[PDB]
Design a protein around this ligand. Structure first.
Ligand SMILES: [Zn+2]
Lengths: 133, 73
């Protein structure tokens, strides 16, 4: 019901979880808490929950390939203004899951997976270090 | 206008007249060219109409835009 509210109210004025089908399974990180004794995920810096569904609705709008350049520009403005919103691994999990269940074009799919390139994923690596030794 | 029940009534008589079989050589040619995409798009539209989620409509509109771009050339 965010897709209907986003038609009349813009991005700057809405500023003044966001994953639809996210569970313990089908996530890059949330699977390992019960099996491997992973630490629970950190609390990030509702200031970021709205941007989560905003980037997800932009990617699912990018699947129809009607006007891909507008959503291209919107996703790149999201990346340039808030570069830490592409760091949560529970969002990378859902966007890869939606790429695994819809019909994306090849440059569009390359762009979506290229936005998640310059990421660190520090917490899952250090929890692998913690469960390792 | 974000009117899904408007575009449904727009393009379902086209699926209705395409479901009675081609009768000429031009209609058989159009069926052999675009009939699989115009069937899978209708299937995805029915999957959206049964359980409402834009995840099922985006693929149908992608197929429809592919058919439209191939027809318009
Ligand atoms: Zn997760």
């Amino acid at each position: 019901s965010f897709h209907l509210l986003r038609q009349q109210m813009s991005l700057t004025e809405i500023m003044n979880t966001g994953l639809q089908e996210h569970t313990d399974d089908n996530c890059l990180y949330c699977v390992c808490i019960e099996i491997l004794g992973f630490q629970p995920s950190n609390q990030l810096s509702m200031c970021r929950i709205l941007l989560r569904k905003e980037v997800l609705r932009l990617v699912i709008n990018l699947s129809s390939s009607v006007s891909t350049k507008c959503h291209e520009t919107g996703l790149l403005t999201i990346k340039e203004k808030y570069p830490q919103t592409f760091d949560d691994i529970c969002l990378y999990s859902e966007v890869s899951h939606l790429l695994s269940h819809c019909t994306f074009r090849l440059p569009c799919r390359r762009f979506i997976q290229e936005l998640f390139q310059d990421v660190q994923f520090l917490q899952m690596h250090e929890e692998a270090e913690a469960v390792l030794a | 206008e974000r009117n899904v029940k408007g575009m449904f009534e727009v393009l379902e008589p086209l699926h209705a007249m395409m479901e009675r079989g081609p009768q000429t050589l031009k209609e058989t040619s159009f069926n052999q060219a675009y009939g699989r995409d115009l069937m899978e798009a209708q299937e995805w539209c029915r999957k959206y109409m049964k359980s409402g989620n834009v995840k099922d409509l985006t693929q149908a509109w992608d197929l429809y835009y592919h058919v439209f771009r191939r027809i318009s050339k």
